[PDB]
Amino acid sequence: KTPYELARERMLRSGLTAG
Amino acid sequence: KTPYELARERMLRSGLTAG
Amino acid sequence: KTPYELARERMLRSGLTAG
Amino acid sequence: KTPYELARERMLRSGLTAG
Amino acid sequence: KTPYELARERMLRSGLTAG
Amino acid sequence: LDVPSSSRYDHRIRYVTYNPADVVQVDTVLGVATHIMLEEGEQYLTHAFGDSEAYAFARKGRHIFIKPQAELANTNLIVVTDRRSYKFRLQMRNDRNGAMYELAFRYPDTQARQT
Amino acid sequence: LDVPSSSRYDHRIRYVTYNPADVVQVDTVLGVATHIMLEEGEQYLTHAFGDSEAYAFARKGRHIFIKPQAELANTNLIVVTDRRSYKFRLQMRNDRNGAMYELAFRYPDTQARQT
Amino acid sequence: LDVPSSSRYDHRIRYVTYNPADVVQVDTVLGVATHIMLEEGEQYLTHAFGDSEAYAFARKGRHIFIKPQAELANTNLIVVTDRRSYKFRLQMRNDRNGAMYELAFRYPDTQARQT
Amino acid sequence: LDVPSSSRYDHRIRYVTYNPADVVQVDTVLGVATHIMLEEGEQYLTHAFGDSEAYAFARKGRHIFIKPQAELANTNLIVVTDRRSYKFRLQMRNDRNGAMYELAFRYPDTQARQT
């Protein structure tokens, strides 16, 4: 909920390259 | 119902060769 | 129900080769 | 339910090679 | 539920290579 | 009614001498396959069970496997070949003891032909 | 009924001398695959289980793996080849101890042929 | 039952001398892949798990990776090749300590052939 | 367990000397990709994660990027090539400090071959 948590979830979720 | 009766029904029912 | 009975049913049911 | 039982069911269930 | 348990389930679940 | 004779090592390996005018007694037990082997060069023609659903039959070449499929599987089996016909009285046992794993035939008719 | 003999290193590697008139005792345990290896140059023809659903069978060439699939998996196995037929009495154990990983055959019939 | 020996640098790299009459003890832990490497020029034929769903198997050439997939993953693995068969006793650990990353085999049978 | 050494400019560039009998410690942090570069002319064969879903793997040629995908991403990585196999102990950090951007290998085995 707090933007640090959403950022951390985004960092875990993303790949090395966008596609 | 009794297993003798089921055996007798099986003996009547079956053919000479399985197939 | 007892595992001896289920084993006996399995032994009657199965073929000589699995397939 | 107990993990020994689930392990035993897994051992019975599995084949010789995964596939 | 606790993140150690979810991590342990993930470790059991995953393969050697992603695909 | 000829009762096969056991080997000196194990009772599960049994022998019988073939007789065209006699029937071979085969004791079948739960969960045991019996291997009956025909004579070399003998060609299978047909078989007949007195009750097909009581036993399972599998053959490849001169090798025959039988196995009970049902309760009280008491029937007969006749296998006819080029040279002879075999008569088996299949009698299911109750105590799962004294099983027969293979039945081997000693043929004195071919021995008489050789004589 | 021949009981295979263990190696001096581990009890899971067992040896038996082949005898056409005897049956080989195989102790199977939960979650263990047993490797039975045939003689070199021997061709598989057929096998038969006294209970097919009790065990899993896999073969590639002269390598056979068996593995119990069910509770109380007590049956027999017969494998017939070009040169011989093997008789196994498969007896599932209860305590998951004394497993057999490989069974290797020593053939004195070929030794007698050499003699 | 042969226990592999660790290297002097890290305990995760272990060595064992091959023995056809013995079984190799492999300690597997949660979340760790073990690299078993076969001998050069050795051709994979078949493998068998005593419990396939307990472990993951991947092979490319002479490189084998295994990895537990389930709780209480205690089974055995047999890999048969052109030259030999490997016997592994796979025993899952509880504390995620003393992992094995690679197992390397020292073959004295080829050394005896050279001798 | 070899801990890579940092450069004199930035701690995010780290060096380690290759040892076939040792494991390389890799500290991974949140939101940071690590570039591991193989030796020139070295051909990738296979890799294995002790936990594939914990890390992301990308490779093009001799360039490997890894990146944690999950919480508590503590596993191992083995990359096998034509010439060697690399052993990495991947340990996720908590404070997002002391990241590793590249890991470069110094190979003394090729140096010994040159010697």
Author numbering:
A (entry chain A), B (entry chain h), C (entry chain k), D (entry chain n), E (entry chain y): 135 to 153
F (entry chain i), G (entry chain l), H (entry chain o), I (entry chain z): 21 to 135
What do the study authors state?
Conjugative type IV secretion systems (T4SS) mediate bacterial conjugation, a process that enables the unidirectional exchange of genetic materials between a donor and a recipient bacterial cell. Bacterial conjugation is the primary means by which antibiotic resistance genes spread among bacterial populations. The recent cryo-electron microscopy (cryo-EM) structure of the conjugative Type 4 Secretion System (T4SS) encoded by the plasmid R388 revealed that the remaining VirB proteins form a large assembly organised into four sub-complexes: the outer membrane core complex (OMCC), the stalk, the arches and the inner membrane complex (IMC). Previously, we solved the cryo-electron microscopy (cryo-EM) structure of a conjugative T4SS. In this article, based on additional data, we present a more complete T4SS cryo-EM structure than that published earlier.
